[PDB]
Structures are given as C-alpha cells and as structure tokens.
Amino acid sequence: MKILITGGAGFIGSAVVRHIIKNTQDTVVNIDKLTYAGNLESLSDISESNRYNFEHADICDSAEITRIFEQYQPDAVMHLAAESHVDRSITGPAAFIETNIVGTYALLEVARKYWSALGEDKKNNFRFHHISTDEVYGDLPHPDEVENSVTLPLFTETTAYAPSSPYSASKASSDHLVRAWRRTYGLPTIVTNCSNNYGPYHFPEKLIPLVILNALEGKPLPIYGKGDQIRDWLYVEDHARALHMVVTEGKAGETYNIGGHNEKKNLDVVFTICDLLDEIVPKATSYREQITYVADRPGHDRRYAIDAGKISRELGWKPLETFESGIRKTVEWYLANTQWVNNVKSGAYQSWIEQNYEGRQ
Amino acid sequence: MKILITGGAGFIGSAVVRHIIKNTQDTVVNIDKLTYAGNLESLSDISESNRYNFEHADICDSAEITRIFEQYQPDAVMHLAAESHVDRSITGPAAFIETNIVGTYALLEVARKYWSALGEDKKNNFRFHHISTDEVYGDLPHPDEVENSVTLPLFTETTAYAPSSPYSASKASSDHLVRAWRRTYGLPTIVTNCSNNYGPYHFPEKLIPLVILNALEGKPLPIYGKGDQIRDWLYVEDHARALHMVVTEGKAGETYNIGGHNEKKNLDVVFTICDLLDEIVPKATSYREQITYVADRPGHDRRYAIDAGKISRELGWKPLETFESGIRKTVEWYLANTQWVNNVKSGAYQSWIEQNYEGRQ
Ligand SMILES: NC(=O)c1ccc[n+]([C@@H]2O[C@H](COP(=O)([O-])OP(=O)(O)OC[C@H]3O[C@@H](n4cnc5c(N)ncnc54)[C@H](O)[C@@H]3O)[C@@H](O)[C@H]2O)c1
Ligand SMILES: NC(=O)c1ccc[n+]([C@@H]2O[C@H](COP(=O)([O-])OP(=O)(O)OC[C@H]3O[C@@H](n4cnc5c(N)ncnc54)[C@H](O)[C@@H]3O)[C@@H](O)[C@H]2O)c1
Ligand SMILES: Cc1cn([C@H]2C[C@H](O)[C@@H](COP(=O)(O)OP(=O)(O)O[C@H]3O[C@H](CO)[C@@H](O)[C@H](O)[C@H]3O)O2)c(=O)[nH]c1=O
Numbered sequence A, B: 001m002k003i004l005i006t007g008g009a010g011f012i013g014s015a016v017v018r019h020i021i022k023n024t025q026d027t028v029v030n031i032d033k034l035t036y037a038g039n040l041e042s043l044s045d046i047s048e049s050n051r052y053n054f055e056h057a058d059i060c061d062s063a064e065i066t067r068i069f070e071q072y073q074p075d076a077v078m079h080l081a082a083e084s085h086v087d088r089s090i091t092g093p094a095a096f097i098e099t100n101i102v103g104t105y106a107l108l109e110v111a112r113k114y115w116s117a118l119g120e121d122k123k124n125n126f127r128f129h130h131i132s133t134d135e136v137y138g139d140l141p142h143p144d145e146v147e148n149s150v151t152l153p154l155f156t157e158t159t160a161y162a163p164s165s166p167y168s169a170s171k172a173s174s175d176h177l178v179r180a181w182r183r184t185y186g187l188p189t190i191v192t193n194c195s196n197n198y199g200p201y202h203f204p205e206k207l208i209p210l211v212i213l214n215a216l217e218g219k220p221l222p223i224y225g226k227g228d229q230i231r232d233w234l235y236v237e238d239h240a241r242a243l244h245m246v247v248t249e250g251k252a253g254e255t256y257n258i259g260g261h262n263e264k265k266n267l268d269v270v271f272t273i274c275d276l277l278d279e280i281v282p283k284a285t286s287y288r289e290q291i292t293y294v295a296d297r298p299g300h301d302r303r304y305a306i307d308a309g310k311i312s313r314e315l316g317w318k319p320l321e322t323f324e325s326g327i328r329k330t331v332e333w334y335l336a337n338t339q340w341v342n343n344v345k346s347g348a349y350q351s352w353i354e355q356n357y358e359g360r361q
C-alpha cells in the first residue's frame, strides 16, 4: 500500500516513517515543510530506501499538494503535520491557526477531489487518517480536588471538547473539519487522539528532552508552578505501532483514543530523570540541585488521562513499554546521540529559550 | 454603555442594533463588510441617530479594526459577523473558513490587546459576547427513530460538539477560540447558541423568507427530501432582546442556549405559510400547488431542539411570541415591504438561485 504522510520529518512522524519502512511492506511519500521542528536527520536510517520518497512542501500550497497526490496515487493518508507546542501558541498563535486549521482544510479539499475521481475499487478502500491530541478534551479533575476515595474520570471517545489553549483549540477545530467532510461529502476519515509522547528524536522544547539536555549542560530544570500537574506518558514507538494499525484496520468514521495508562506528576518525572543521570553520568553533585520553580503557564491544564479501552478491545493494541522501561531508553538515546542533538539546536532554538524562560512571567 | 457590534447590517444583527437604539440608553458602533447579506436599508429607522455610527470594514483587517477600537473605546463587544448559509458552505467552504474562523481569531487578538491596556475599572467590566448557533451540537434523535413513548433529548449547554457541515464546523471552531482565549489570557468572554431565527429583514435564501417570496411570485416551494426534518423556531425580535440581556447581565465564562421551545417539521411550516397567504392574498388556486419535493441536502441534520432552561432561570428571559403569532407577523411584514425586497434581490441573488436549485443534485 502507498501511504502519503504529512509531517514525517518530525518527532512522531519520523517514528511512523521508520516503522513502516523497517517493519512493513508498505511504501511512503513524505510531505514536510521542514520548520524548526522538521529534521531530515531523524530519517537517516531509511532515506535511501527505494520505498521512500521525500517532498519538501507546505500543506497550504494546494497546487503543489495536488500535483503530489496525482504523481504518487496514494492508497491512504496519515496527517501529522502541525505546530505542536502550547507555549509557542500562547505568544505566537497565528502560525497555529494557519497550519493546524487552514492547513487541514486545504489538505481535506485536495484529498476530497482526489478521492471522488478514483475508480470504484480504490475509492472504497481509500482512508484519510487524521492524527490528533487528547488536549481537545480540556482538563480533568485533579487528585487534590476530590475525595481520596472517588474514582477519577478519564478521557473517552465520547468526552466533550473543551480546548484550553490556542494550540488545543487549533487541533479541536481540525478534528471538526475532518468529521464534517465525512458527513457532508462521504470522505472515509478516521481520527485518533493520544496522550503525551516521549522518546528518541524528541525536539528539546518539550518537558522530557528539555530536562535531560539542560541537566547534562549544567542548566536549570524549569518546573511550571508546583510541578503537581499530571500527564499520561506513551513511548513514541508504541504510538507509531498503534497508528499503522489504525490506518490499516481502523473503521471509517470511528475515533480511537491512544495512551498507555500511566498518569505521572511532572516533578516526579523530573526526579526520575535526575536519578537515572546520577546513576549513568555521576558528578560532584546530584542533578536534583538544578531543579528550579518558575512562573506557571497561563491557563495550564492540571491533568490529562486517557482511557484506551476502545482501541484495545477493537483492534487489540497494547503498549509494549512501561514508563520505567521507556524512560531509561530515552535517557540512553540522548547520551548516545549528541550528533543529532547538536544539529537540531540552532541559533533560533536559543532565541526561543531566551524568550520563554529568561525573565519569565 | 458603548457597544461595538460586528455584522450589524445583517438579519439578526440589524434586529440587535434597532432594539438597542429604540429601547435602551446604550450607544452603538456597527462594523460590517456589507457582503451579499449586508444591507444598510435594514437600518433605515435608526441610521440618523447620533447614538449610532457605521464603519464599512472587514473583521480580518486588523489595522483598521484596531483603529476603530481606539476611536470609539467600546465597553463591550457583540460579534455577529459571519457567513451563515449551510447550502453555500457546501459548494464554497473557503469563505466560511476565512470569515468565521480566521476572522474571529483576528477580532479576538485586537480585543485582547485592547482589553489588556484598559484602566482597572473599565478592564474589569469589559465583555466580549460571541453570538453562535445550535448547529455546533450536531444532530439529535428524530421522532421516527425512537419509541413513541421515550422522551426525546434536547440540546443543553453541556452537550458535546459534533458539527455536520462546513458552516457548523466553522462556528464550532470559532466557539473554541473564544473559550481558549478566556482560559489562556483571561479575556472576559460569553457565548450564546440559539435555534433557527425567522422574521422581518430575513435574506430570501433561508426556508421561510424563500418560501414566502417564491409563493407570491408563482414559483416552486422547494422541499429538501421529505420535509420531515425538524427545527426550533425563534422570532428574531425575541433573540435580540435576549442578546442585549446577556451582554448586559451575563456572567463571564458562561454559555447560554437561546430558543423558544417550538419544534416544527419543515413541511408543516410550509403549509402554514400557504394557508396564511390563501387567507390574506387569495387567488385562483391554492399556494399549496407550488409545493415541490427536490433532492435532499447532503449531510442534512434531521432534528434540532434547544433547552433554554438555563438562561430562563438565571437571567429570567422568555420569548414574547409564539410560532403562531410570529409567523403571521412575518408574512405581513413581507407583504408590506416590497421596497426592501426589491433592493435585496440582485443579479447575484438570481445566480445563487440557479446554482442551488436548477438541475439540483
Ligand atoms: N507530541 C505529542 O505527545 C502528541 C500527542 C498527540 C498528538 N500529537 C500530534 O502529532 C502530530 C505530530 O506531533 P510531534 O510529532 O509531536 O510534532 P512536531 O513538532 O515534532 O513536528 C511537526 C512536524 O510537522 C511539520 N510541519 C509544520 N507545519 C507544516 C506545514 N504547514 N506543512 C508541512 N509540514 C509542516 C514540521 O516541519 C514537523 O516535522 C501533530 O498533529 C500533533 O498535534 C502530538
Ligand atoms: N439565522 C439564524 O437562525 C442564526 C441562529 C444562531 C446563530 N446565528 C448566528 O448569528 C450571526 C448572524 O446571522 P444572520 O444574522 O443569520 O447572518 P447574515 O447572513 O444575515 O448576515 C451576516 C452579516 O455579517 C456580515 N459579514 C460577513 N462577513 C464579514 C466580515 N468578514 N467582516 C464583517 N462583516 C462580515 C455580512 O455583511 C452580514 O451583514 C452569525 O454569527 C450566525 O452564525 C444565526
Ligand atoms: C516545556 C515545559 C513543560 N512543563 C510542564 C507543563 C506540562 O504540564 C508538562 C508537559 O509540557 P509539554 O512538553 O510542553 O507538553 P504538553 O503541553 O503536555 O503537550 C504535548 O502533549 C500533547 C498531548 O497530551 C500534544 O498534543 C502536544 O503537541 C505536545 O506538545 O510539563 C514544565 O513544567 N516546564 C517546561 O519547561
């Protein structure tokens, strides 16, 4: 099967591309604009395969995207291209509106026109898989707000949308466009929403990769507020396996939440990383001494937790890693990949760091 | 109080403007781009008031909208500007994405920067009222799908979003942006969602005004599908009164559904209009003979019904009209305003009619 993938040069996208080339018989055409987050070095292991092709383009460029669909004649689409950092969306929302909302719209239109003109056979098998986030569901009650006995709620596929930030509002909107295109034109679409991902090739602006690298460089480990906020952690390779399973066996018009059932508090995750480094790369003092409490993120969601029961009983997917096994692999990966880290950290990166952390709030 | 209103030259907007000038002590600055749907003639009774000012502009023009906010120093905002026809959104969705989503984004940003720089007093009292639709909630179970005993569900403020068309997806997205701006930056926003409006100054593309005018011209009365679909009808003047009540007494961060609790089937509404005309403007044959069944609307939602309990018990709002009293006033209004009707029906209007109705589906 020929799969057209948007955002394949990013964190989760590159994991999807590497998995398809190494473990399946499918082919791939990767469309990526290569923003600060797009890095071809993340696809080094497979860039030479004859079953892989790369196209440097913007999903907002209709004419070029149309040309690409006609040339490769994809059997399915996996849309991962997007602006993904909440902190960047707070100070610079325009890019999120343009890429996440208008960009999805532009891609849906090219796909609709393409799909409508396909032969009976290929037309019935076509699939448009939209990769999304759990953040569209809003915030959940926190352990310190309820009775130490009551069972805390989780995010399910029928939970109401209530996005808190420009980023999550962006994604929630893209989700609506995908489902409306299905109801109005008949486009066979699928939507997935998953929890926080972590692991190899993660850009150094998200919690885990930022903390690991700052620790090794002797810099502060910035905790927003008290660090009691909770997140559900899923190893990126597990997400990749689930995604290929969905685009291949998923049912048109369905939604699947993806996660690993691993609620953890931020501060706890930072301590775990510090203990791992104290063990592997010991020094005069403990890495914990670099931990610093800074001004909280505006509108910060205090707790995310996914209920992946549905995809489990319907597609039979289960994560292979545990947070414990995955977090150690992540730390080891960064220690062994300084070359990749140095190539991703540019002058632009340092500008973002100064903007978001120095003289913070 | 100085109120800045977007889309004040349209159907619902002009009703809001006329109500404020005639029945309150507030002032108004009206911003409207004057699309096919904008009509200054709908504001003839108040365009000369010194408490009213008009600005011909596009909400996407940040520089000009910024200048307008600084000149009039509004105390509140009522955002009604938008592309509102589902049928137009099916064939030309681009305009809906641009005006409804990107336009709301642009307006939210100008309002945020304006609000943040206000004095302590005026800053705490500022209000950004977003006027929206019930269609963001998706479709509801229809009487012919359930047990003739079970109570049919209604739309409440906690119903999950599930838009079916490009139009409703557009509005659902604008809703998310408004709430996220509130959670992230603290902007005091309010959101209202109401059922189908009908009454004076309604553009001839929606069911009721289209049926009334076509009947009088001896043209067909087009029924999509079987005409068994259901809608909740609210007289436009009742909506206007509710809206001024919300922007004035509504609580920041709250949502209020607005309706009249009047579920009616389309075919039944058409028969009602026909009997009213047979009575008032009798002719050789009955107007019923012009009723014609045509190809259904793609993705058509079969039933909408609002539960306005909340706004009723919290703000004390109730509709003054009944569908019976309001529908007669509507028919009488069109018979007495042929001047307005002739000015709104242009060559562009006829092009839309040919496009949507001749050789239909
Ligand atoms: N990070 C997570 O834990 C997580 C969880 C659930 C969902 N998601 C979703 O997964 C997808 C990828 O996330 P990452 O993998 O987290 O993102 P990322 O920031 O690492 O990469 C985004 C990628 O998209 C590309 N891109 C951005 N704008 C583009 C445009 N206009 N045209 C083409 N390419 C463009 C970038 O160049 C980059 O390769 C997103 O849609 C995101 O919402 C992320
Ligand atoms: N008609 C209904 O039953 C109903 C019900 C619920 C909600 N609403 C909402 O009420 C609002 C107004 O509906 P109508 O009153 O039904 O709409 P309308 O179609 O009659 O008028 C829209 C108005 O907005 C203006 N406009 C369009 N794009 C603009 C832009 N970019 N900048 C400035 N002005 C622009 C038009 O010139 C016009 O005067 C909409 O936001 C709609 O979603 C309508
Ligand atoms: C960057 C950073 C983050 N944090 C906290 C805030 C959050 O509670 C937690 C994780 O923050 P982030 O890495 O930015 O991730 P988060 O906002 O949860 O969102 C991620 O996970 C989402 C899915 O849950 C994805 O849709 C997003 O694209 C992805 O970026 O760590 C800090 O305390 N300090 C920091 O410096």
Ligand SMILES: Cc1cn([C@H]2C[C@H](O)[C@@H](COP(=O)(O)OP(=O)(O)O[C@H]3O[C@H](CO)[C@@H](O)[C@H](O)[C@H]3O)O2)c(=O)[nH]c1=O
Pocket (backbone or CB within 6 Å): B084, B085, B086, B087, B132, B133, B134, B135, B194, B195, B196, B197, B205, B206, B207, B208, B210, B222, B223, B224, B227, B229, B230, B231, B266, B297, B301, B304
């Ligand atoms: C135009 C037209 C409509 N209809 C039917 C389809 C619908 O079930 C019903 C009403 O159609 P419309 O007048 O287009 O309205 P509808 O789609 O319900 O949407 C309206 O009501 C919405 C709120 O419910 C608003 O948000 C929209 O802006 C407004 O345009 O009548 C016909 O049978 N024939 C027609 O020619």
